[PDB]
């Protein structure tokens, strides 16, 4: 009786939200950006090849100086690269080799990683002893660690396969806030530039917008037909893009609370692993299972170019803070640095 | 290149040397993935041979490292293991269809197309007793079992009841039928009949891994 009545009200509320989104869908982003000229053909060359990982690379993250980056591989090695010289700055042996994510702190003093061990390990890069040591192991997730991002040297957000995200106080080692509401494994998260909000994509084909301080879900974004594997905020923080196994990328708007544009092609039938934006946000770069990275026009949903330089799955990619270059990691155990030429 | 850059580059090469040394050490062991249901008894298989549970056992001076994770997302991590050890409980007729669908998902997984599966049809003693009692019928759960006959070329074990032999070959055929439906020789299933006291499981994995590695080499020598 009471249970049946309540679940009927949820359906009415879903129709109310769907009608509300349809009310503000006066125009389409495609119609708005029809007049603007296309970006043309985007040609990028492999400037650097980072060699030394001996297994599948699962994650990479640029440092804020746009020169240092950290990559994680399932050979149990965290490597910090000097991208300008291809020199290896550090090689951190992982206690568990099944790493799935890695993060570079914005200060540059810490790196984080974690995988099937359900632990987010914090490594101190600036020690008087001259070696990298584990500073914290964040326990509390009951599933594998899929993504992690620093807010500062003391706070980090992690997404897990136990359908929850958590905000951690690194000094005390306890999760101050738990973000619940996903019905599937959360595979990725992206932080807003002001670090007051973050979006997460799960295997329930939905993206949720979370308030860091308040700790609740503000908005839920649906429209994908399969598991979401990648997510990335727009540079101004008012939009984000997702990548799913249905071979499509979708651009959701926070304020319009709905999808604005889909980035898919008929030839593309493979899943998407990673997504990122260029510095101005005009380009959407996505990594695919078909060994390629497709550069999309974010405004016009046109495939601007292709990065074809890997012999296995493109598992991760990232764009520097200064926008100068993009790095792609792959299951073929190599990292490549790309940018164009005049 | 400055004086500090040369010292930094020399540090990078010392890192590269230890990266290659550790990679060679990691290749000296064979990695196995252990999968199965709650009633499979895969833990008892491991214990006799000996978030992630790991066990190391050695057969003829060859080191095996088996991982029991305790799933379409984290199964991609084990994309380059030597073999998957899939364990089922053949005695429980009710959950046999669950195991067949569970095996079908693993076999047809997009990221396990080149991984051979070492099937372990566990708890054969319970299966033999269940057929002998006759209280439960496989035909109730599988209608096609009533019209199934033991092949003339079959080689039953000595002193084995034909009723048990007919049941064991039918259960094995169901898993093999899934295996032969797809794959095209990229991976091969290696079914085995094991019990709760069998002590030859480790050698069966070792012998099957020899065929798995040999098949890997043959593709390298031929698919050029």
């Amino acid at each position, epitope marked *: 009786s009471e249970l049946d009545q309540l679940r009927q009200e949820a359906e009415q509320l879903k129709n109310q939200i769907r009608d509300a989104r349809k009310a503000c869908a006066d125009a389409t982003l495609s119609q708005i950006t029809n007049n603007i000229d296309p970006v043309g053909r985007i040609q990028m060359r492999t400037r650097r090849t980072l060699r030394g990982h001996l297994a599948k690379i699962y994650a990479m993250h640029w440092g804020t100086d746009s020169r240092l980056l950290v990559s994680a591989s399932q050979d149990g090695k965290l490597i910090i690269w000097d991208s*300008y010289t291809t020199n290896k700055v550090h090689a951190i042996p992982l206690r568990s080799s099944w790493v799935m994510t890695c993060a570079y702190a914005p200060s540059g003093n810490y790196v984080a990683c974690g995988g099937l061990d359900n632990i987010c390990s914090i490594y101190n890069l600036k020690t008087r002893e001259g070696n990298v040591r584990v500073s914290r192991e964040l326990a509390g997730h009951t599933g594998y660690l899929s993504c992690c991002r620093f807010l500062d040297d003391n706070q980090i957000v992690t997404s897990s396969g136990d359908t929850t995200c958590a905000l951690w106080d690194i000094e005390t080692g306890q999760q101050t806030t738990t973000f619940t509401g996903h019905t599937g494994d959360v595979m990725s998260l992206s932080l807003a530039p002001d670090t007051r909000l973050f979006v997460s994509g799960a295997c329930d084909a939905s993206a949720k917008l979370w308030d860091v301080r308040e700790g609740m879900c503000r908005q839920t974004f649906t429209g994908h037909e399969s598991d979401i594997n990648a997510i990335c905020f727009f540079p101004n923080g008012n939009a984000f893009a997702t990548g799913s196994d249905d071979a499509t990328c979708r651009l959701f708007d926070l304020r319009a609370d709905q999808e604005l544009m889909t980035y898919s092609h008929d030839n593309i039938i493979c899943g998407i692993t990673s997504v990122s934006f260029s510095k101005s946000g005009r380009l959407l770069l996505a990594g695919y299972d078909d060994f390629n990275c497709n550069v999309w026009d974010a405004l016009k949903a046109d495939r601007a170019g292709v990065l074809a330089g890997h012999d296995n799955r493109v598992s991760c990619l990232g764009v520097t803070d200064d926008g100068m270059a993009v790095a792609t990691g792959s299951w073929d155990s190599f990292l490549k640095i790309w940018n164009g030429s005049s | 290149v400055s004086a*500090e850059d040369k*010292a*930094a580059a*020399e540090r990078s090469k010392m890192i590269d040397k230890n990266l290659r040394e550790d990679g060679e050490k990691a290749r000296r062991t064979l990695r196995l993935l252990l999968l199965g249901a709650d009633n499979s008894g895969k833990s008892t298989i491991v214990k006799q041979m000996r978030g992630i549970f790991e066990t190391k056992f050695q057969v003829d001076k060859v080191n095996f490292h088996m991982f029991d994770v305790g799933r379409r997302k984290w199964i991609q991590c084990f994309n380059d293991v030597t073999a998957i050890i899939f364990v089922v409980d053949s005695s429980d007729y009710n959950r046999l269809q669950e195991a067949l669908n569970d095996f079908k998902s693993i076999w047809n997984n997009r990221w396990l197309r080149t991984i051979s599966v070492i099937l372990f049809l566990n708890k054969q003693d319970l299966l033999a007793e269940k057929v002998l009692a006759g209280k439960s019928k496989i035909e109730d759960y599988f209608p096609e079992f009533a019209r199934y006959t033991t092949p003339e070329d079959a080689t039953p074990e000595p002193g084995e009841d034909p009723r048990v032999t007919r049941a064991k070959y039918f259960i094995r055929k169901e898993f093999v039928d899934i295996s032969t439906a797809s794959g095209d020789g990229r991976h091969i299933c290696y079914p085995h009949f094991t019990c709760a006291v069998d002590t030859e499981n480790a050698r069966r994995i070792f012998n099957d891994c020899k065929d798995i590695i040999l098949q890997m080499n043959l593709r390298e020598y031929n698919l050029v």
Partner: single-chain antibody
Amino acid sequence: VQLVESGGGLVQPGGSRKLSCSASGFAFSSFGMHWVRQAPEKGLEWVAYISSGSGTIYYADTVKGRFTISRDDPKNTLFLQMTSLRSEDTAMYYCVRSIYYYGSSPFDFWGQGTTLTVSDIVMTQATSSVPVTPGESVSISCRSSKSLLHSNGNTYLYWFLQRPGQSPQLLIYRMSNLASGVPDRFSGSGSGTAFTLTISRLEAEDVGVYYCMQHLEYPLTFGAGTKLEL
């Protein structure tokens, strides 16, 4: 982090002596090591360098052929085998650790030193002494015969402070960066061949001799040193 030197003492001319540097509290095998000596009432002079992994070894011209530098990583010991010792070799010998990667701080830690008694880019610090008062801003100037700015954007200039009775301490590395544990009042500014070390709100502890060192190329050379006195 500790660096203890031993083996020094009074030796006859033309003799041989073995200096040891025992390291504790840090990963010794990860750091390159230098020997730096200081003649009595004189400035610092770089002697030798051995890299991490012992693959690269450098010597000063005044000691090349007579000194041999070696390390024992399992024992965390640094060695300096000296032969044909001259009266010019009478100095306090300092053991210095230095690690080299992007953003590292070489020459960050110095040893206490051991005393030995026997019976090229030019770095200029024209101002030998500067009378100072507490709370007042002080500037120290350094000059180089060659431009220390490399084509990679780094300017390989270092600043050291040797308080009376103490070993030198790193203040500024690569001409602008502030070493760990150093108050923010110290600031390094420079361009090309001219460099300035600014000390805002001078205190009693800041009193000492300041040395500017170049790390553009070997041999590493030090300035004469500028002494601050109250």
